[PDB]
Amino acid sequence: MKKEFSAGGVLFKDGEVLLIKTPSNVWSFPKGNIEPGEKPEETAVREVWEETGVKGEILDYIGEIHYWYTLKGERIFKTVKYYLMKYKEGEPRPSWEVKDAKFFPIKEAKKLLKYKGDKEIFEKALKLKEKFK
Amino acid sequence: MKKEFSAGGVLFKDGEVLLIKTPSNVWSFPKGNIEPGEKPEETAVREVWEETGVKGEILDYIGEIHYWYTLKGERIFKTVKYYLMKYKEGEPRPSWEVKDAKFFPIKEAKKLLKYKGDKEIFEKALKLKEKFK
Amino acid sequence: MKKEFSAGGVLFKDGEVLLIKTPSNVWSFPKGNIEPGEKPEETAVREVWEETGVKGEILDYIGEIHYWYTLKGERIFKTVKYYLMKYKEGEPRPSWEVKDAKFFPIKEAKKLLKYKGDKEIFEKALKLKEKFKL
Amino acid sequence: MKKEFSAGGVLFKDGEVLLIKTPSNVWSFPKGNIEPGEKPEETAVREVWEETGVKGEILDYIGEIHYWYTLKGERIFKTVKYYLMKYKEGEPRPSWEVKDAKFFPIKEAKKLLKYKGDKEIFEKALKLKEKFKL
Ligand SMILES: [Cl-]
Ligand SMILES: [Cl-]
Ligand SMILES: [Cl-]
Ligand SMILES: [Cl-]
Ligand SMILES: [Cl-]
Ligand SMILES: [Cl-]
Ligand SMILES: [Cl-]
Ligand SMILES: [Cl-]
Ligand SMILES: [Cl-]
Ligand SMILES: [Cl-]
Ligand SMILES: [Cl-]
Asked: DSSP letter at D48?
């Protein structure tokens, strides 16, 4: 078994948040694995851009969710740190690793989320979004 | 005899104290192993910096706590020296190591702390803190 | 609960195995925490080098062991992956963290090992090294 | 409570060993405290040079001596690692920390050393010295 380190973001663009659809047909947030020597904030920005083609700015740390899963017979413990981001540039274009990447009005996003983990993160994110905007 | 000597910091910013959330979900103070050739004070400043992204200045030496634990059938002796710090700059951001990093009002901090050692150290820190202001 | 992931190495040179003498006087294998963004193989080669001054080359994955312990009343899970290595260069020189670093004939090393995990891993290592004629 | 790390050497020149005289008037081996980032072998070379003005080359690790003592109202667990060294450059001169620095024939050195640890380290060093043209 091994541990996996990932970081991603809840990026907002004028009342809308960036979401992606996983191979399992679940809408969640853009995230990705750490690169050698990166701090989580660095990983978060890079992976969001690579997965959605959208470049964002980190405003604050929201939280972390974790879970076990298997890949090729080995148990993997994954931890994902999430950061509140604000739109910079680019357009949503899902990489081959996600079924889709699209902006959704906050109202629309709330319902799409499945995993209680993502919903908790989004909730926290919205609250933090206030103090900043 | 295995001996693990660490150093940590109890940093304050306008009536608030800096705490980190450990993998056990318990809120505590940033601390880490004192590397060979490193003064405990340097270890404390570095660990606070690395785990929270907050830079602090040491005001005084609070105290030290001792405890043992068993690993692979062997007794290990551990001690942690704590230093009182005052905020200098930086914004609370957790490392891949911790779940969170946040400032808490003293009243609330006393509530979050769990380890008897953290409580004893915090109480000593509050008294030593008056010396300054 | 907190989970710790480490990696270590079982390195052979001219038919002998490299062991380190821990603070408790127990001879064991070098190992260390797998840093974020680090492959377990990188961790093993690095730890062997830092603890013994010996540079090794990964031959293959041996296996992993795990165990639990309590710290400050909290349960902690720890697992360690081990890799088979062949000597590349360097002389045994212990780090500040260990008492000694030395090569031992397999027969002697088997008697020196104490930790259950080390014994299990060494057994697997001995069966695996046959392929590389070490 | 704190840990202290030092390293030094049993350095030979033309069959003689380099000794220093401590403030307590005892002949012993040159050694000193680790600096930030140093491996023990690095500390040993630098400290022997600073303490005696003699540059030595490390040939092997001898062993270590450890003990608890009190410094400025605090218990310190000190570990001193020793290395067999070959003379390379310099003339012995005591630093401000020692009373003298001088080379002595092995037979005389054996008689001069007083601390049990020093005697044991010297015994080990002489055995290791046999493997080199030192
Ligand atoms: Cl597995
Ligand atoms: Cl990873
Ligand atoms: Cl990911
Ligand atoms: Cl620690
Ligand atoms: Cl362990
Ligand atoms: Cl380890
Ligand atoms: Cl601890
Ligand atoms: Cl003490
Ligand atoms: Cl020291
Ligand atoms: Cl010294
Ligand atoms: Cl040299």
From this structure: H
